Amino acid sequence: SDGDQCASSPCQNGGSCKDQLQSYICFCLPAFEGRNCETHK
């Protein structure tokens, strides 16, 4: 049920990729931060 956003690794820094109802939220690691790890600490 709903699972396409993470079809091309829309996240960065090996961040995770979750699928929501509006789009998707990646779960970066303690090393980075942001919906796409775009904020690498």
Angle formed at CA 5 by CA 28 and CA 24, multiple of 5 degrees? 50
The experimental method, as deposited, was NMR
Joined together, the tokens standing for residue 39 give 């904020």
Domain ranges of the chain: 1-41
Contacts with 6 (C-beta within 8 Å, 6 or more apart), sequence order: 17, 18, 19, 24
Instruction: Give the CA-trace dihedral at 29, 20, 35, 11, to 10 degrees.
Output: 70
d(CA 31, CA 7): 23
Cα 35 versus chain centre, distance: 6
Residue 2's identity, in one-letter code, is: D
d(CA 23, CA 36): 12
CATH topology of domain 1-41: Laminin (2.10.25)
DSSP one-letter string for 1-41: ----GGGS---STT---EE-SSSEE----TTEESTTS-EE-
N- to C-terminal Cα separation, the chain: 33
d(CA 4, CA 22): 12
